[PDB]
Amino acid sequence: HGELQYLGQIQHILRCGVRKDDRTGTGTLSVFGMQARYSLRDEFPLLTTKRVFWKGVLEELLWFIKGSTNAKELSSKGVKIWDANGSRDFLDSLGFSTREEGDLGPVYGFQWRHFGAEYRDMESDYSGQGVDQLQRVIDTIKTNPDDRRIIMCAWNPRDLPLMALPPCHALCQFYVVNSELSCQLYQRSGDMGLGVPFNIASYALLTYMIAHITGLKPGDFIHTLGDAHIYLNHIEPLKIQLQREPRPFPKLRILRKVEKIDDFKAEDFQIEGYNPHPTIKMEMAV
Amino acid sequence: PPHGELQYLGQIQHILRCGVRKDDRTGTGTLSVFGMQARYSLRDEFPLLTTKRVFWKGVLEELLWFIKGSTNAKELSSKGVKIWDANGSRDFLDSLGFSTREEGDLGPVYGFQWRHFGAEYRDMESDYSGQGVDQLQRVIDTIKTNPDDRRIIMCAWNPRDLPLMALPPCHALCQFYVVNSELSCQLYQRSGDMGLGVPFNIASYALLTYMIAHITGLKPGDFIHTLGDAHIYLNHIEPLKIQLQREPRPFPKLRILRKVEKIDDFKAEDFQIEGYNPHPTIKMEMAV
């Protein structure tokens, strides 16, 4: 079972991790550098030891793809994961006093579709400015699948001062061999309790989507971690989760033929056979 | 638990055993695996591989060249370090449409992205003083003032500058980490020529970690090497089979011979490698 690599990482950190203070003031147990491999072949790695917020995964990805940097746009679909980092108080603490609530700055959506464009605000029109990395990845996969440069990068040093949160998913790399598409994510910072399960699902989903558009089979998702950490108030909750036996991963079916990445809608996806254990409350450190 | 040269030899064995055939840009052909990670301790030793002699002069000189912000291959070539000459040659540059550039102008690669990320590239000899983001000095400053930061990153991958690069960076980014007065480094290498590139590259980022540790008053911890497309070129199979027959020897030490306050002030004569006793050099063709 693929899920055993996630649970193995949690237990590796519980026992070898080092105490480390953090930006949030909460404290963490932390390890630097880990890697896990999840198969996408006839299965989809949505964790079963706790229910992962699939609606959030799907809507957050559609939002990235659209190029949005407005947390209220996501919040109005019922997904509140970016609300704390886009709030008035949070934005004021970084010194963005005149920024509208929900304006996260030039984060993923903007960097993926408009890398290098000049950010103004979340409502501006950026059509045709900057580099559309997402569409370039798709185009390269179709014409030169052997390419070792199929990368999408959200980390933009010049824009960091304007971001409410510098991207945790600094970059991802695609790989093709034998008509099978794989993806590796470099995650610089991983909240192992709250974020990583959700982050795994997102990139697996992105890989299914791209595979669908390019006529390829999904292969592997490789998850690479920089600072992999467990917040101190997640230790007891993760201990509960580790008592649970994984159930089989579900499958993902895409329900119509879709030609452009921008045409996918929430209704085109169906998770089949997902039957997780209950959610576990893990407070978000902000 | 293996923390030295055996991880590297193990990756080689794994690609020879389970690697898939994959064609590549250079027309040589490879055996390839996607996604690998190894961890090299830097604690009282320096990971210069011993089953073949690694080109230490080239490692050192290339790192000093990156640090000073250069993207001119002639500056290495002038020192007898030829590792960038095929990608900086007149013919290679012209083959990519760069007929007006001077030979050796690799474009806005590491030196430029590390010291001036976001500046508008003109040519290799332009004055970029005060332009773009000095990522390297920022890394060093964050390490001194906020060692717990999970954002201590230097990124060479610049999508806007890609069309101008002779070769897009293989070392897309690196991340630093501090705990218990120890500095570690992780490298994301999108593409690793396991025979020729990877030993030399491990040594590069181990050396950068020692230099930064020295400037910040920290001890070197680990170097974590992460690979995207880890590949053995088909014409490196014979040389690698010879290498896998040889027993690893203890790693050397690295000594910094003087107290140096700024990263820019390091010179080649400040570094001494001690007790390096490798098996001979093995020649391996460079795929262009």
Ligand SMILES: Cc1ccc2nc(N)[nH]c(=O)c2c1Sc1ccncc1
């Ligand atoms: C998107 C986001 C924004 C800020 C975050 N802050 C912390 N501390 N942890 C996080 O995982 C986190 C995340 S991912 C997340 C958050 C909530 N539910 C599932 C996944």
Ligand SMILES: Cc1ccc2nc(N)[nH]c(=O)c2c1Sc1ccncc1
């Ligand atoms: C710097 C560089 C430039 C282009 C390259 N092309 C191939 N194919 N492999 C490589 O390792 C490579 C390298 S690293 C290298 C080259 C020669 N000696 C040791 C290390």
Ligand SMILES: O=c1ccn([C@H]2C[C@H](O)[C@@H](COP(=O)(O)O)O2)c(=O)[nH]1
């Ligand atoms: O998709 C996401 C977004 C954020 N985080 C986490 C990691 C950190 O705990 C925190 C970000 O804080 P810094 O690393 O930037 O300090 O949120 C994730 O795990 N996944």
Ligand SMILES: O=c1ccn([C@H]2C[C@H](O)[C@@H](COP(=O)(O)O)O2)c(=O)[nH]1
């Ligand atoms: O420091 C370096 C520079 C280049 N290469 C390799 C990897 C590839 O074999 C080749 C670059 O080719 P592409 O991945 O860009 O196609 O050189 C390395 O391994 N290390």
